[PDB]
Assembly symmetry: C5
Amino acid sequence: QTDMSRKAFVFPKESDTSYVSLKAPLTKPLKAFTVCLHFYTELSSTRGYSIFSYATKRQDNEILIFWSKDIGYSFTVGGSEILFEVPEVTVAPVHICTSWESASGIVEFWVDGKPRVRKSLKKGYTVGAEASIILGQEQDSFGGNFEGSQSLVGDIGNVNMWDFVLSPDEINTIYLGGPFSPNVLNWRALKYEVQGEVFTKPQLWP
Amino acid sequence: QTDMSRKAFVFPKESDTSYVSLKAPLTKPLKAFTVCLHFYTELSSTRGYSIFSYATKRQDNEILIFWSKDIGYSFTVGGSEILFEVPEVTVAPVHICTSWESASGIVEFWVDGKPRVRKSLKKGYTVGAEASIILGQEQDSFGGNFEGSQSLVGDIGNVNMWDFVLSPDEINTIYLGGPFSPNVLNWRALKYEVQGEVFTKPQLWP
Amino acid sequence: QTDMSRKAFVFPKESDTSYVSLKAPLTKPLKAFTVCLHFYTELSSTRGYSIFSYATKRQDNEILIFWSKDIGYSFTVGGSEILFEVPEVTVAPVHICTSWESASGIVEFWVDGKPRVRKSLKKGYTVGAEASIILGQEQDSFGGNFEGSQSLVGDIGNVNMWDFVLSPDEINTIYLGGPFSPNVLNWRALKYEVQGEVFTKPQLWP
Amino acid sequence: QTDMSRKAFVFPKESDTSYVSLKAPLTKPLKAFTVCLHFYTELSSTRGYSIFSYATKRQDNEILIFWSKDIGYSFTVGGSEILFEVPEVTVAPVHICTSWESASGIVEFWVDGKPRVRKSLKKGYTVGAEASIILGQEQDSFGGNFEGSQSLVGDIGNVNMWDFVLSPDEINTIYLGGPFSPNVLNWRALKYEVQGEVFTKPQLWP
Amino acid sequence: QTDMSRKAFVFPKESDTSYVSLKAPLTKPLKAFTVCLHFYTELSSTRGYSIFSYATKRQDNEILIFWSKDIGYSFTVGGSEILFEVPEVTVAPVHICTSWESASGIVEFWVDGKPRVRKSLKKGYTVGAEASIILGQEQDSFGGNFEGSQSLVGDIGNVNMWDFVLSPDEINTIYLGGPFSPNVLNWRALKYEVQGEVFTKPQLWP
């Protein structure tokens, strides 16, 4: 466990081998969860890329935050996809917090602290705990099979995961860089493995 | 009577059966009244929907706040409609307070605290007290007969009704979330009934 | 004399009979004067209308503040007209103070506190005191002969008249709602007569 | 010498005879100098006009600040002209301070306190002291020969001249209306002669 | 060594001979370095020009910050070029800090304090110390061979160089005009040689 406060991973070269593998001390299936992270890249106006790949033995797209060109952020759970349209994109670091609950099928998507409309997805599903979490690549098969046109070039950090739905105030605090205690994946006590061209540098975002 | 402070109803699925029925302890015909409520949805640029349906035995459109695509907010009382044009629409929660008086036929429409021009409507009319108040659907017949293309997808709350015209200062306080005492329908001591896919969640708006 | 502080006249229906007649305790011809008033209407983008009609036995257009569509505010004294172009119009209440002096022919036009370029008009003229001041209509004949397409729909108040040119600081105070003492027509001690569909309500502007 | 603090000259009518003649207590040729003044007019989008005409027996355009339509401010010394492009023009009073030095040929042009790029002009020249300074007209011959299409309609004041290059801080103070001591032409102790339709009024700019 | 605080070099005439030659007390090859400087010119929308030319016996483009029209800032090291696109350009002084590291090949480009995405360039290279640093010209051969269409017209100063990568906080301080200690090239104790039409003046930027 190492403190990545004020640090981020760098993926400077578009490639199909540079990636960082994350290990979650997970033991129970998730009925709900939220994920927050900073990322910064200029590919938005160019081609699609993968923000966060959570994969399991049954599905290569167990959880996938994906940008599709001219469309926006594409959130998918259990192999279904909603879209959250972004008409115009700005060139700057962006913070995003997304949360899903099994009971209602509600999905909350927060971009830059402003909440998007709630929607429905895969009501009654169960997300398995046997996970491979990968960053900088979209994983179409368990622990491998990446795509260069889906690999992400840029800077990312502060990745934190919970297993229950936070309240709006809480999201505001996360945005506010306040104290908080993630209980599934800790940026503050994180465990990781690096592969290929990846590097550790101070974060650009404040 | 339950306190819905900081809470709203959620209609996530476009459907013709999810709706919430509200009971007003009303005993006198309204010579005037104001209604305030928060709502948030992205259908504005897509298709028409119903904000607030007040219906009685004589008219399915006794009071109707309705968005008509490319037009704006459409207010109707006793079966007549004015229009309040909105040239461009923004994607964010919006607050609206509307008031009508029997004596003059004046209608005041407040959107985001900025008052629209006063207009005329149905001077000398009487609104009956035998009411069915429905939310999330447009009711074309007493207690039923909804339309999927008119059902509203999104988040709403803080619905409050008076029976006399408030002053502009008062509207400002309402916007300001100050203390106030509604005497027909209380969000603070509200009575309700829920049907179909509807849920209670914390509000997104501040 | 009644105090109209925080009050305005309402003309909700486009008509040729609703109007309010104002009586000035005037006894000397005006060599100069300023007029200030608030008005609010959405007809700006639709058709022309009359802001303030000052008429006498010799001229139906002794003083006329008139909006001409696609052109802007049209100020006329003694039967001649300048134009003050407004390229684009916003939908909100607008304050306007205009002043004319017989000695120089200078006309000062203030809109929302920002001064327009000074211009020339009818140098050496005399405005008569035998006046009929009318609001909400353009008067083409002494005390009558209105035009529906020139009648004004909306809300107006704070109408005040002096008989000498105020300084820019003074205009700023007027805009600032400071204390002031009009000596020809007092909103604070005003005298009036109402005809047709006209009503008294609290002002919308702050 | 009269104090024109808070006062400006008015040229309301486009004409070829209204002008104001200024007398400088000048006795030495200028190796450098700066000139500052306020002016306000709406002709910018219509036709060209003259801001400041400094003329001598040898050249009708010894110094000329001239607006050329669709181009911008045109500064000329000793019969040569640079251009300072203005893409779009706003309708408001504008302050301008310009300075030239004989040693380097550098010209500094300040508009609304923001400095334009330095440029070169007429290096090694000498400006003569036998001057006729004219305002509101472009003078193509010593003390006469004006052009209606070059005469300026509007309001101007605060005209001050030095004979050495001020520093940027100094310009900032001038903009800031701070205390300062001009040594060639004083608005504070100015000497003038008026001809035709010209008048003295309080300034509109703050 | 002379203090150029609050001073800049001026290149007013487009020419192929006016230039300023800078001598670095350098004795070791650079494994990394950052360079910061202010510059101001209006050629951005007209033609390409050279910001900073660092040249050695082996390469005329050892380091080159170059603006290419319709493209933006073009950074090149060891004869390779990345591009940092600028969609639209504003007319004002601009501050730029750029840094490169031999270990990773990372390049950081800061414009107006806002960081551009990190990229890759020439990993494992070595920059030689036998340098000719030239300003206002692009040098295609050791100590000569300039191009008029590449010469830069305008005002520049505050040029400072380090030999290791500063942190983001540090860049912020540089932008903030805070105290700092450059160890390769000091604006505060700078050594220089001037040739042709170049002059020393107070800086325009704050």
